Amino acid sequence: MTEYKLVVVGAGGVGKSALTIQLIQNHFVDEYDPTIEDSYRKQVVIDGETCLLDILDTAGQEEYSAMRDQYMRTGEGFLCVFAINNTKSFEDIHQYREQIKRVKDSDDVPMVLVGNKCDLAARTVESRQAQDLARSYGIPYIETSAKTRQGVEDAFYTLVREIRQH
Amino acid sequence: SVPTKLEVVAATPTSLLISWDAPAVTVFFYIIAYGETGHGVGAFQAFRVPGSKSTATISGLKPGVDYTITVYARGYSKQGPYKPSPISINYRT
Ligand SMILES: Nc1nc2c(ncn2[C@@H]2O[C@H](COP(=O)(O)OP(=O)(O)OP(O)(O)=S)[C@@H](O)[C@H]2O)c(=O)[nH]1
Ligand SMILES: [Mg+2]
Protein backbone atom coordinates (compact mmCIF):
# COMPACT_ATOMS: atom_id res chain seq x y z
CA MET A 1 0.00 0.00 0.00
CA THR A 2 1.53 3.42 -1.08
CA GLU A 3 2.43 5.73 1.86
CA TYR A 4 2.36 9.58 1.55
CA LYS A 5 4.56 11.47 4.10
CA LEU A 6 2.73 14.81 4.57
CA VAL A 7 4.23 17.56 6.79
CA VAL A 8 2.08 20.39 8.19
CA VAL A 9 4.17 23.57 8.78
CA GLY A 10 3.34 27.10 9.90
CA ALA A 11 3.57 29.70 12.68
CA GLY A 12 2.27 28.98 16.21
CA GLY A 13 -1.49 28.81 16.82
CA VAL A 14 -2.61 28.87 13.13
CA GLY A 15 -4.55 25.52 13.41
CA LYS A 16 -2.10 22.83 12.14
CA SER A 17 -3.12 20.32 14.90
CA ALA A 18 -6.89 21.13 14.61
CA LEU A 19 -6.75 20.64 10.78
CA THR A 20 -4.81 17.31 11.15
CA ILE A 21 -7.18 15.97 13.88
CA GLN A 22 -10.25 17.00 11.80
CA LEU A 23 -8.90 15.07 8.77
CA ILE A 24 -7.79 11.99 10.76
CA GLN A 25 -10.31 11.71 13.68
CA ASN A 26 -13.26 13.89 12.36
CA HIS A 27 -13.63 16.19 15.42
CA PHE A 28 -12.65 19.78 16.32
CA VAL A 29 -10.11 20.29 19.16
CA ASP A 30 -11.14 23.68 20.75
CA GLU A 31 -8.37 23.51 23.46
CA TYR A 32 -4.96 25.10 22.62
CA ASP A 33 -2.14 22.61 23.40
CA PRO A 34 1.07 23.80 21.68
CA THR A 35 2.68 20.87 19.78
CA ILE A 36 6.24 19.50 20.24
CA GLU A 37 5.87 16.82 17.49
CA ASP A 38 2.96 14.41 16.69
CA SER A 39 2.58 11.71 13.94
CA TYR A 40 -0.79 10.40 12.58
CA ARG A 41 -1.22 7.39 10.23
CA LYS A 42 -4.53 6.58 8.48
CA GLN A 43 -5.52 4.31 5.57
CA VAL A 44 -7.86 6.18 3.15
CA VAL A 45 -9.15 5.84 -0.44
CA ILE A 46 -8.44 8.95 -2.60
CA ASP A 47 -9.82 8.94 -6.21
CA GLY A 48 -10.35 5.14 -5.89
CA GLU A 49 -6.67 4.49 -4.90
CA THR A 50 -6.01 3.09 -1.38
CA CYS A 51 -3.09 4.76 0.47
CA LEU A 52 -1.67 5.39 3.95
CA LEU A 53 -1.30 9.04 5.01
CA ASP A 54 1.64 9.51 7.42
CA ILE A 55 1.08 13.11 8.65
CA LEU A 56 3.71 14.92 10.77
CA ASP A 57 2.14 17.70 12.87
CA THR A 58 5.11 19.99 13.68
CA ALA A 59 5.73 22.49 16.41
CA GLY A 60 5.11 26.05 15.36
CA GLN A 61 7.82 27.84 13.36
CA GLU A 62 10.52 28.97 13.70
CA GLU A 63 11.88 25.57 14.54
CA TYR A 64 15.57 24.85 15.27
CA SER A 65 17.36 24.45 11.89
CA ALA A 66 18.66 20.92 12.72
CA MET A 67 15.12 19.60 13.52
CA ARG A 68 13.27 21.47 10.69
CA ASP A 69 15.87 20.18 8.14
CA GLN A 70 15.08 16.52 9.15
CA TYR A 71 11.29 16.63 8.49
CA MET A 72 11.79 18.86 5.39
CA ARG A 73 14.19 16.16 4.01
CA THR A 74 11.77 13.20 4.62
CA GLY A 75 8.46 15.04 3.81
CA GLU A 76 6.99 14.22 0.33
CA GLY A 77 4.42 17.05 0.49
CA PHE A 78 3.91 20.16 2.64
CA LEU A 79 0.71 21.83 3.90
CA CYS A 80 1.92 25.45 4.49
CA VAL A 81 -0.65 26.84 6.94
CA PHE A 82 -1.26 30.46 8.00
CA ALA A 83 -4.26 31.95 9.87
CA ILE A 84 -6.32 34.68 8.11
CA ASN A 85 -6.31 36.70 11.43
CA ASN A 86 -2.42 36.59 11.74
CA THR A 87 -0.53 38.75 9.16
CA LYS A 88 2.88 37.57 10.57
CA SER A 89 1.87 33.89 9.93
CA PHE A 90 1.18 34.84 6.26
CA GLU A 91 4.42 36.91 5.80
CA ASP A 92 6.54 33.99 7.21
CA ILE A 93 5.22 31.51 4.51
CA HIS A 94 7.76 32.68 1.86
CA GLN A 95 10.81 31.75 4.02
CA TYR A 96 9.24 28.34 5.02
CA ARG A 97 8.98 27.54 1.28
CA GLU A 98 12.58 28.79 0.60
CA GLN A 99 13.85 26.48 3.39
CA ILE A 100 11.91 23.44 1.97
CA LYS A 101 13.34 24.17 -1.56
CA ARG A 102 16.92 24.43 -0.17
CA VAL A 103 16.67 21.09 1.78
CA LYS A 104 15.00 19.31 -1.24
CA ASP A 105 17.45 20.97 -3.73
CA SER A 106 14.33 21.52 -5.98
CA ASP A 107 12.02 24.45 -6.93
CA ASP A 108 9.22 21.85 -7.62
CA VAL A 109 8.07 20.46 -4.20
CA PRO A 110 4.44 19.20 -3.72
CA MET A 111 2.85 21.94 -1.58
CA VAL A 112 -0.57 23.47 -0.77
CA LEU A 113 -1.05 26.93 0.79
CA VAL A 114 -3.79 26.91 3.46
CA GLY A 115 -5.43 30.03 4.88
CA ASN A 116 -7.10 28.63 8.08
CA LYS A 117 -9.78 30.10 10.47
CA CYS A 118 -11.97 31.33 7.54
CA ASP A 119 -14.95 31.10 10.04
CA LEU A 120 -13.61 34.17 12.02
CA ALA A 121 -15.18 37.62 11.26
CA ALA A 122 -12.08 39.86 11.73
CA ARG A 123 -9.57 38.81 9.00
CA THR A 124 -6.26 40.71 8.47
CA VAL A 125 -4.93 38.71 5.41
CA GLU A 126 -6.91 39.13 2.15
CA SER A 127 -7.66 36.09 -0.10
CA ARG A 128 -6.28 38.12 -3.09
CA GLN A 129 -2.77 38.44 -1.45
CA ALA A 130 -2.67 34.67 -0.66
CA GLN A 131 -4.06 33.59 -4.09
CA ASP A 132 -1.40 35.83 -5.79
CA LEU A 133 1.35 34.26 -3.60
CA ALA A 134 0.18 30.66 -4.34
CA ARG A 135 -0.03 31.49 -8.11
CA SER A 136 3.55 32.96 -8.00
CA TYR A 137 4.66 29.51 -6.60
CA GLY A 138 2.45 27.50 -9.04
CA ILE A 139 0.72 25.70 -6.08
CA PRO A 140 -2.95 25.41 -4.99
CA TYR A 141 -4.46 27.84 -2.41
CA ILE A 142 -7.44 26.80 -0.22
CA GLU A 143 -9.14 28.58 2.72
CA THR A 144 -10.14 26.22 5.57
CA SER A 145 -11.96 26.13 8.91
CA ALA A 146 -10.90 23.27 11.22
CA LYS A 147 -13.96 24.41 13.28
CA THR A 148 -16.64 23.93 10.49
CA ARG A 149 -14.56 21.47 8.30
CA GLN A 150 -14.80 23.89 5.29
CA GLY A 151 -11.97 22.97 2.83
CA VAL A 152 -10.19 20.55 5.26
CA GLU A 153 -10.52 17.25 3.31
CA ASP A 154 -10.02 19.19 0.00
CA ALA A 155 -6.69 20.68 1.32
CA PHE A 156 -5.08 17.30 2.31
CA TYR A 157 -6.46 15.35 -0.72
CA THR A 158 -5.27 18.20 -3.01
CA LEU A 159 -1.75 17.75 -1.46
CA VAL A 160 -1.88 13.95 -2.17
CA ARG A 161 -2.94 14.75 -5.82
CA GLU A 162 0.07 17.18 -6.09
CA ILE A 163 2.40 14.31 -4.91
CA ARG A 164 0.82 11.78 -7.35
CA GLN A 165 1.08 14.29 -10.29
CA HIS A 166 4.79 15.18 -9.50
CA SER B 1 1.94 26.60 35.90
CA VAL B 2 5.10 27.23 33.83
CA PRO B 3 6.64 29.68 33.61
CA THR B 4 6.03 31.80 36.73
CA LYS B 5 5.64 35.50 37.46
CA LEU B 6 4.32 36.69 34.06
CA GLU B 7 4.16 40.54 34.01
CA VAL B 8 4.05 43.56 31.65
CA VAL B 9 7.35 45.46 32.33
CA ALA B 10 6.75 48.25 29.72
CA ALA B 11 3.69 49.32 27.71
CA THR B 12 2.80 51.75 24.91
CA PRO B 13 -0.71 52.20 23.45
CA THR B 14 0.11 49.54 20.74
CA SER B 15 2.76 47.30 22.41
CA LEU B 16 3.62 45.31 25.57
CA LEU B 17 7.03 44.13 26.76
CA ILE B 18 6.31 41.01 28.88
CA SER B 19 8.69 39.18 31.25
CA TRP B 20 8.49 35.80 33.06
CA ASP B 21 10.67 33.63 35.38
CA ALA B 22 12.17 30.60 33.56
CA PRO B 23 11.77 27.23 35.34
CA ALA B 24 14.91 25.40 36.66
CA VAL B 25 14.58 22.91 33.73
CA THR B 26 15.77 23.25 30.07
CA VAL B 27 12.94 24.73 27.93
CA PHE B 28 13.04 24.04 24.13
CA PHE B 29 10.69 26.99 23.29
CA TYR B 30 7.91 29.24 24.57
CA ILE B 31 4.62 30.14 22.82
CA ILE B 32 3.27 33.67 23.50
CA ALA B 33 -0.49 33.92 22.74
CA TYR B 34 -2.59 37.12 22.86
CA GLY B 35 -6.17 38.18 22.05
CA GLU B 36 -8.94 40.45 23.35
CA THR B 37 -10.10 39.31 26.83
CA GLY B 38 -13.05 36.85 26.42
CA HIS B 39 -12.20 36.13 22.71
CA GLY B 40 -13.90 33.15 20.96
CA VAL B 41 -12.05 29.93 20.00
CA GLY B 42 -9.15 30.67 17.57
CA ALA B 43 -9.61 34.51 17.85
CA PHE B 44 -5.99 35.16 18.98
CA GLN B 45 -2.43 35.32 17.59
CA ALA B 46 0.62 33.39 18.87
CA PHE B 47 4.37 33.30 18.16
CA ARG B 48 7.27 31.10 19.23
CA VAL B 49 10.42 32.36 21.02
CA PRO B 50 13.47 30.24 21.90
CA GLY B 51 13.77 28.65 25.38
CA SER B 52 16.71 31.00 26.20
CA LYS B 53 14.30 34.03 26.33
CA SER B 54 12.42 35.30 29.43
CA THR B 55 10.94 38.40 27.64
CA ALA B 56 8.96 39.18 24.46
CA THR B 57 7.44 42.20 22.67
CA ILE B 58 3.79 42.04 21.56
CA SER B 59 3.15 44.70 18.83
CA GLY B 60 0.18 45.89 16.71
CA LEU B 61 -2.32 46.16 19.62
CA LYS B 62 -5.33 48.56 19.63
CA PRO B 63 -5.08 51.38 22.23
CA GLY B 64 -7.53 51.22 25.22
CA VAL B 65 -8.39 47.48 24.67
CA ASP B 66 -8.30 44.62 27.31
CA TYR B 67 -5.91 41.80 26.22
CA THR B 68 -5.25 38.36 27.73
CA ILE B 69 -1.61 37.20 27.32
CA THR B 70 -0.73 33.47 27.81
CA VAL B 71 2.79 31.91 27.89
CA TYR B 72 3.37 28.17 27.31
CA ALA B 73 6.68 26.33 27.88
CA ARG B 74 7.47 23.21 25.78
CA GLY B 75 10.35 20.74 25.65
CA TYR B 76 11.56 17.30 26.68
CA SER B 77 12.91 15.76 29.90
CA LYS B 78 13.83 12.27 31.21
CA GLN B 79 10.04 11.92 32.07
CA GLY B 80 9.03 12.52 28.40
CA PRO B 81 7.39 15.57 26.74
CA TYR B 82 7.47 18.74 28.95
CA LYS B 83 3.95 20.26 28.56
CA PRO B 84 3.20 22.28 31.73
CA SER B 85 0.00 24.37 32.10
CA PRO B 86 0.35 27.95 30.78
CA ILE B 87 0.36 31.23 32.81
CA SER B 88 -1.95 34.15 31.82
CA ILE B 89 -2.45 37.84 32.71
CA ASN B 90 -4.84 40.60 31.54
CA TYR B 91 -3.65 44.11 30.54
CA ARG B 92 -5.50 47.12 29.04
CA THR B 93 -3.87 49.10 26.14
N1 LIG C 1 -12.26 29.52 15.11
C1 LIG C 1 -11.31 28.63 14.73
N2 LIG C 1 -10.41 28.22 15.64
C2 LIG C 1 -9.45 27.37 15.25
C3 LIG C 1 -9.38 26.89 13.88
N3 LIG C 1 -8.32 26.06 13.80
C4 LIG C 1 -7.78 26.01 15.02
N4 LIG C 1 -8.47 26.78 15.88
C5 LIG C 1 -8.19 27.00 17.31
O1 LIG C 1 -7.01 27.79 17.51
C6 LIG C 1 -6.22 27.20 18.55
C7 LIG C 1 -4.89 26.76 17.95
O2 LIG C 1 -5.06 25.64 17.10
P1 LIG C 1 -3.98 24.49 16.97
O3 LIG C 1 -4.38 23.50 15.91
O4 LIG C 1 -3.67 23.98 18.33
O5 LIG C 1 -2.74 25.40 16.45
P2 LIG C 1 -1.27 24.88 16.01
O6 LIG C 1 -1.01 25.53 14.68
O7 LIG C 1 -1.22 23.37 16.08
O8 LIG C 1 -0.34 25.56 17.14
P3 LIG C 1 1.16 25.00 17.50
O9 LIG C 1 1.03 23.49 17.91
O10 LIG C 1 2.01 25.14 16.18
S1 LIG C 1 1.76 26.18 18.94
C8 LIG C 1 -7.01 26.07 19.14
O11 LIG C 1 -7.74 26.56 20.28
C9 LIG C 1 -7.98 25.69 18.02
O12 LIG C 1 -9.21 25.20 18.54
C10 LIG C 1 -10.41 27.38 12.96
O13 LIG C 1 -10.44 27.04 11.75
N5 LIG C 1 -11.29 28.23 13.45
MG1 LIG D 1 -0.18 22.08 17.14
Author numbering:
A (entry chain E): 1 to 166
B (entry chain F): 3 to 95
Question: Which sentences did the original study use to describe this structure?
Answer:
A comparison of the 12VC1–HRAS(G12C) structure with the structure of 12VC1 bound to HRAS(WT) would allow us to conclusively differentiate the two possibility. However, we did not obtain crystals of the 12VC1–HRAS(WT) complex, probably due to its low-affinity interaction. Thus, we improved the affinity of 12VC1 to the wild type by mutating the residues that formed the pocket that “sensed” G12C (V33, A48, and K50) and by incorporating the T35A mutation that improved the overall affinity to RAS. The resulting clone, termed 12VC3, had improved affinity to wild-type RAS, although it still retained 90-fold selectivity to G12C, and enabled us to determine the crystal structure of its complex with HRAS(WT) at 1.98 Å resolution. Overlay of the two structures and molecular dynamics (MD) simulations revealed that there are no significant differences in the backbone conformation between HRAS(WT) and HRAS(G12C) captured by the respective monobodies. Similar degrees of differences in side-chain orientations were also observed in other crystal structures of HRAS(WT), thus eliminating side-chain orientation as a main energetic contributor to the high selectivity of 12VC1 for the RAS mutants. Taken together, these findings demonstrate that RAS mutations at position 12 can be selectively recognized in a noncovalent manner by a small pocket within a binding protein and potentially other types of molecules.
Activating mutations in the RAS genes are frequently present in human tumors, and these RAS mutants play important roles in oncogenic transformation. Here, we report a monobody, termed 12VC1, that recognizes the active state of both KRAS(G12V) and KRAS(G12C) up to 400-times more tightly than wild-type KRAS. The crystal structures reveal that 12VC1 recognizes the mutations through a shallow pocket, and 12VC1 competes against RAS-effector interaction. When expressed as a genetically encoded reagent, it potently inhibited RAS-mediated signaling in HEK293 cells overexpressing EGFP-KRAS(G12V) and -KRAS(G12C) but not EGFP-KRAS(G12D). Together, these results demonstrate that 12VC1 is a highly selective, noncovalent inhibitor of KRAS(G12V) and KRAS(G12C).
